[PDB]
C-alpha cells in the first residue's frame with residue numbers, strides 16, 4: 001500500500017482469466033481483482049501511448065462516474081508495460097454486437113442503446129469533457145445488454161501519427177464534421193456530429209458509414225454538404241434526430257441534453 005496513490009492499483013492483486021479484444025493500445029483481458037471483483041485489464045502496448053500525460057489525466061478521469069460510462073478503477077503505473085483497469089463489459093464492443101444477426105433486435109432496443117450513449121455523453125458534456133473519438137467501436141455492452149461509453153478522451157495520448165493526422169490512414173474521417181476535417185476544429189459539436197454517426201451505425205446494425213467510399217471521398221462528400229441517409233430501421237423521427245447532428249454550421253447542432261430529450265420524446269411516441 002505504501003507505494004500507491006488513490007489512482008493506483010497493485011498489479012499483484014490481479015488474476016488474468018481470458019482475452020476480451022484488441023485496439024489502438026493493444027490487448028484487453030478479463031480478470032479478477034483481489035480474487036473476487038470482475039475487471040477489464042487494458043495492457044497498454046509499449047510505445048503506443050503518451051503514458052506520463054495519460055497518468056496525470058487518469059487522476060481527473062477517476063472522478064468521472066456515471067452509470068452509462070465505463071468506470072475507470074485505477075492504473076498500474078510502476079512498470080511501463082502499464083495497465084488501465086476498468087469496468088468489465090461481458091458482451092464486448094457495440095460494433096461487433098450490432099453485427100451479430102442472431103440478436104434479431106427490435107427498434108425499441110436500438111433506441112435504448114442510443115439513449116444509453118446519450119446519457120453518458122450528456123454527463124461528459126456537463127463536465128466539459130470531450131470524448132474526441134465517439135463511435136460504436138468505443139462503446140461496450142455489459143451482461144445485461146446495457147451500452148456504455150468507453151475510452152473517452154484517450155485519443156489525446158495516441159503516439160501513432162496515422163491516427164492523429166487528419167489525413168492519416170487511421171484518423172476517424174467517417175465520424176468527423178467538416179470543421180474537423182478542414183481545420184482541426186474540435187469542440188462539443190464535433191462529439192455531437194460523431195454521436196449522429198453512432199446513431200446511424202446502431203440503426204444500420206453496424207454497417208460502415210459511407211461504406212462505398214474511401215476516406216478521401218467521404219471527406220469530399222461531407223465537405224460538399226452531402227450526408228448519410230436514413231437506415232431502413234430508423235423511423236422518420238429517429239432519422240430527424242441523427243440528421244440534426246450533421247448541420248454544416250456547428251452552432252446549429254443540438255446539445256446532448258437536447259438530444260436526450262428528443263430521444264425520450266420518441267420513446268414515448270413510438271413505444
Ligand SMILES: Cc1cc2cn[nH]c2cc1-c1cccc2c(N)c(C(N)=O)nnc12
Nearest residue numbers: 020021022023024025026040087088089092
Ligand atoms: C473498446 C476497446 C478499446 C481499445 C483500445 N485499445 N485496445 C482496446 C480494446 C477495446 C476492447 C475491445 C473488445 C472488447 C473490450 C471489452 N470487453 C472491454 C471491457 N471493458 O470489458 N474493454 N475493451 C474492449
